[PDB]
Write a protein that binds this ligand. Structure first.
Ligand SMILES: C[C@H](NC(=O)c1ccc(C#N)n1C)c1c(F)cccc1Cl
Length: 261
């Protein structure tokens, strides 16, 4: 079961607050609701939390607790000191090849874990890749794409597979996440968002659906050839042409090991 937490256990998407738990220290509280009583929801919510709490691995964030109070509902998640991946890439300092390589490996590990549990992320992107004080990463579902009830209770398209652009009814598959990961590889080397010279959303969506992809040229820092190859394979228009995360890991780990570790 999930840990039940109380708002009075604390000191000083949704209302996101760095909160100091009076016993366990710094955590992140995502208060998803404040308003009229709605106890009818409760059961479901609790259940959902438990389900989502079974997803435990070094490379995914932990649900530390839930607050289920009269008209106040909160998810409490571990605190990731360095914030999201894009924030980390965009700070004054910098990162060796080896470290960006490790970040990629840890992303692969996390996604392989989720897929091994039968869980499709659906919204993998740098905002959902959080970084600890030691530059190790954990994948998160901050937009609550998989927490259906908490989402109900309660938006870049740059990393979304083209089969979902202008088709919201198509079901996502593991390959949806593999595409997202390809654009993440790009962003890790460009240190910024793709498509900066797109005309506008409509035309850009149509261009991506017709095969346009992030500009490999706008990567001006060094990116290993096999990571360029990898991102191009993972963003193939045909989802069937994209590899699985196990296939990805079984190529990437020894490359990281033989050239980057
Ligand atoms: C295991 C991880 N859990 C959280 O992302 C999570 C835990 C606590 C909170 C909050 N708030 N989140 C978003 C998680 C899921 F549960 C479901 C789908 C993807 C991922 Cl990465």
């Amino acid at each position: 079961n999930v840990i039940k937490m109380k708002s009075s256990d604390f000191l000083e998407f949704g209302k996101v607050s760095l909160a100091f738990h009076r016993t366990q220290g710094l955590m992140i509280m995502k208060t998803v609701y404040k308003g009229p009583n709605c106890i009818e929801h409760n059961e479901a919510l609790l259940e959902e939390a438990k389900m989502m709490n079974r997803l435990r691995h070094s490379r995914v964030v932990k649900l530390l607790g839930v607050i289920i109070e009269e008209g106040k509902y909160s998810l409490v998640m571990e605190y990731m000191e360095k914030g999201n991946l894009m924030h980390v890439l965009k700070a004054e300092m910098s990162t060796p090849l080896s470290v960006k390589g490790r970040i990629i490996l840890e992303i692969i590990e996390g996604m392989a874990y989720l897929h091994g549990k039968g869980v499709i992320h659906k919204d993998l992107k740098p905002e959902n890749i959080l970084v600890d004080n030691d530059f190790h990463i954990k994948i998160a579902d901050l937009g609550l794409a998989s927490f259906k009830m908490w989402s109900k209770l309660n938006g870049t398209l740059y990393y979304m597979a083209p089969e979902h652009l202008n088709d919201v009814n198509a079901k996502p598959t593991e390959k949806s996440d593999v595409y997202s990961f390809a654009v993440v590889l790009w962003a890790i080397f460009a240190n910024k968002e793709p498509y900066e010279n797109a005309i506008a959303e409509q035309q850009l969506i149509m261009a991506i659906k017709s095969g346009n992809r992030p500009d490999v040229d706008d990567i001006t820092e060094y990116c290993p050839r096999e990571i360029i190859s990898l991102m191009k394979l993972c963003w193939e228009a045909n989802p069937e042409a994209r590899p699985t995360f196990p296939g990805i890991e079984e190529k990437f780990r020894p490359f990281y090991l033989s050239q980057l570790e």
